[PDB]
Write a protein that binds this ligand. Structure first.
Ligand SMILES: COc1cc2nc(N3CCN(C(=O)c4ccco4)[C@H]4CCCC[C@H]43)nc(N)c2cc1OC
Length: 438
């Protein structure tokens, strides 16, 4: 029994990973939509409800599961087992009925690319969410009233098992009937996305991108919960109590997968072909192509294998037109590569005054430092880009900024015999003494 020690850490790390994504991850998903007015979209309305269901499990289902394993058989069915039988179904029924609202929203979204925005608003989204909880409560808390008094002979309050009238009636209303709607709708979405993808406004690639991310979510839920919900009806015609325990735990694990799916899935950058196409267009300075590619569904914030985005390479290669349209198409102006360089670092290096001003105008980090601690002022001062050094200082660039090698933008100007820049950087440093000078 030497493995008993190693099993603790392995399970503990997996349970720690779960809690992290399931509680913190979901709260962060909720807060991102809650504190951004531009992110309050009907699709984002359903994922907040999906995160609320995962959160509601963690606080009202897992405590009962944790209390069982830790303390043992303090399993007082009359109350204890009735609450976290009821709460368990409620959360699961809420989750799958939310995925029904998603599966339908995504068919309305994919099929009707330019019609959807008007069709589905915040008002129509709240009603769909409202319905889910009204149904979910009836489906979950129904049986707890319908079957009021405990059975004679063979009661199983504190067991997943029961008679066929519950095993089928519950599993139908809580899984299979919802599953039918989902699979039928995401089967319909499946073929429309190919039919319009073969045939082919960016709207289709914004909503077929959305349909793909959420399709993974829908699949991972089905994959997680099918094993349990296969075994409840199938038992009536099998599994030990210890078998049911891991099948439920598998279902619970899904609560952490959603935040992970949103961090781990590339679908906006799913078109590896269309993604690397834009990265090249923006670098080569091909305004016609970049505009066309963006309009055809190309991700503005595509990450290179090194970490460079189209805005990086555009700022580097000195293509002002592409920098403007990228920003105009919602480009991360403070995008970082592996060493932390932003497009302003690159614009500063290659001496493009036009782009440095445009980046700053669009809210670029003037003092943004890379892993070495090198700021855009370090690079502009190093190569003799005096116009950029002045623009940078004007936007409040820090002259005292130091890299890992202890070198400051002034030092680099001196060490490259840049007399003009060194004077402007030395003057800039005595700014605090010009409180006395009016
Ligand atoms: C996700 O959907 C469902 C979840 C459900 N969860 C329970 N639980 C949760 C905890 N259980 C066990 O751990 C467990 C281990 C072995 C048998 O049960 C049992 C036993 C203790 C009391 C609550 C029970 N009971 C249901 N009847 C149930 C029904 C569901 O849909 C039809």
């Amino acid at each position: 029994p030497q493995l008993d020690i190693t099993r603790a850490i392995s399970v503990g790390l997996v349970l720690g990973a779960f809690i992290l994504f399931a509680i913190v991850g979901n709260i962060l998903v909720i807060l991102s939509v809650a504190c951004n007015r531009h992110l309050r979209t009907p699709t984002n309305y359903f994922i907040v409800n999906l995160a609320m269901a995962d959160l509601l499990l963690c606080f009202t289902v897992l405590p009962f599961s944790a209390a069982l394993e830790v303390l043992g058989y303090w399993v007082l069915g009359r109350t204890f087992c009735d609450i976290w039988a009821a709460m368990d179904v409620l959360c699961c029924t809420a989750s799958i009925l939310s995925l029904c609202a998603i599966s339908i929203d995504r068919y309305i979204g994919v099929r009707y690319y330019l019609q959807y925005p008007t069709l589905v608003t915040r008002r129509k989204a709240i009603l769909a969410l409202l319905c889910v909880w009204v149904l979910s409560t009836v489906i979950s808390i129904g049986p707890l009233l319908v079957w009021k008094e405990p059975a004679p002979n063979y009661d199983k309050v504190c067991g997943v098992t029961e008679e066929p009238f519950y095993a089928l009636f519950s599993s139908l209303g809580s899984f299979y009937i919802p599953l039918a709607v989902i699979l039928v709708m995401y089967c319909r979405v499946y073929i429309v996305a190919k039919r319009t993808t073969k045939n082919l406004s960016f709207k289709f690639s914004r909503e077929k991108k959305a349909a793909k991310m959420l399709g993974i979510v829908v699949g991972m839920f089905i994959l997680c919960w099918l094993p349990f919900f296969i075994a409840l009806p199938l038992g009536s015609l099998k599994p030990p109590d210890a078998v049911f325990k891991v099948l439920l735990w598998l279902g619970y694990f899904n609560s952490c997968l959603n935040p992970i799916i949103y961090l781990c899935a590339e679908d906006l950058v799913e078109d590896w072909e269309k993604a690397r196409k834009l990265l090249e267009a923006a670098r080569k300075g091909q305004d016609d192509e970049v505009r066309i590619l963006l309009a055809n569904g190309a991700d503005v914030n595509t990450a290179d294998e090194t970490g460079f985005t189209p805005l990086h390479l555009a700022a580097w290669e000195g293509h002002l037109g592409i920098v403007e349209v990228l920003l105009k198409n919602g480009a991360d102006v403070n995008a970082n590569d592996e060493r932390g360089h932003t497009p302003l670092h690159l614009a500063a290096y290659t001496g493009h005054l036009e782009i440095v001003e445009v980046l700053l105008k669009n809210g670029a980090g003037v003092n943004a430092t890379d892993v070495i601690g090198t700021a855009p002022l370090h690079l502009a001062a190093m190569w003799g880009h005096l116009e950029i050094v002045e623009v940078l200082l004007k936007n409040g660039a820090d002259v005292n900024a130091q890299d890992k090698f202890g070198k400051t933008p002034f030092d680099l100007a001196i060490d490259n015999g840049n007399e003009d820049i060194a004077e402007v950087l030395q003057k800039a440093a005595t700014r605090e003494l010009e409180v006395l000078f009016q």
